[model samples]
Target: MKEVTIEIKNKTGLHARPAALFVQTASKFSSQIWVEKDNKKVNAKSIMGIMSLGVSQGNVVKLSAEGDDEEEAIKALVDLIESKFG
Candidate 1:
């Protein structure tokens, strides 16, 4: 398993659109992805799971994955956040 911590930079946080994009990106990977915040972890592919964390701008989130493409999966997800979801 690989893990990385990233802070959300988007002004609105991972709301509807951003959360949808996040879920879409995570679904592209074969790895089992998870997001954790405040000790609560949930499946990254689930939009509701992600939103439940109440991630907002400046909140750091823990991203981890385990699978053949764990590295790439983490990188892509991290990059997506870094890009502010464009």
Candidate 2:
């Protein structure tokens, strides 16, 4: 089990493009990844789950993973957000 809180720095936040990219990155990992916003957690790999959160710029989100690749997954997701989902 592992988790890290990250802020959305991109202009559009985690929406359309960014959300898709986040989901794409998360899907590559074998661990179960999730995003928690406003105290609500949702599957990070699901486009619908991520989009439904309505996370926007400046929102703080927590990434958590529990599995063999948990540490890597959490770091990658956090880095992705930190990089503004480039």
Candidate 3:
């Protein structure tokens, strides 16, 4: 997920179903993934941490991962955001 930055284009931001979907998607990867916003970071696969991070629309969130599936994980997450969490 390194070098990947995505804008949360969803109007509602990441919460509820979106947050669950994010965690669900991230948990599929072997990499250590986290979401960063406003200089604060939290585990991407944790609903609690993701909820606390409270990333909103227009925020540039950084996804960082270190493991065998890093590229796939990063691309998928970024693609999700680009798709507005659809």
Candidate number achieving the greatest TM-score relative to the actual structure: 1
**Model 1, span 1-86: residue lDDT tens:** 99998998998787878889999999999999999999999999998898899999999989999999999999999999999999
Prediction 1 global C-alpha lDDT? 0.93
Evaluate all candidate structures by whole-model CA lDDT and list the values in order. 0.93, 0.90, 0.85
Q: Which candidate comes out best when scored by lDDT? A: 1
Local error of candidate 2 at residue 65 (angstroms): 0.4
Model with the higher TM-score, candidate 1 or 3: 1
Q: Scored by Cα lDDT, where does model 3 land?
A: 0.85
Q: Per-residue lDDT of 1-86 in model 3, one digit per residue for the tens?
A: 36577788887688878887889999999999988898888989989999898877777888888889998998888888788888
The runs of at least 3 residues in candidate 3 whose Cα sits more than 4 Å from the true structure, single-residue gaps closed, are none
Cα lDDT for residue 42, candidate 1: 96
The 10 consecutive residues of candidate 1 with the worst lDDT sum are 11-20
**Collision pairs in model 3:** none
Query: Model 2 off-target regions past 4 Å?
Result: none
Error of 3 at 28 (Å): 0.6
After TM-score superposition, what is the CA distance of residue 31 in candidate 3 from its true location, in Å?
Answer: 0.7
Query: Which pairs clash (backbone N, Cα, C closer than 3 Å) in model 2?
Result: none
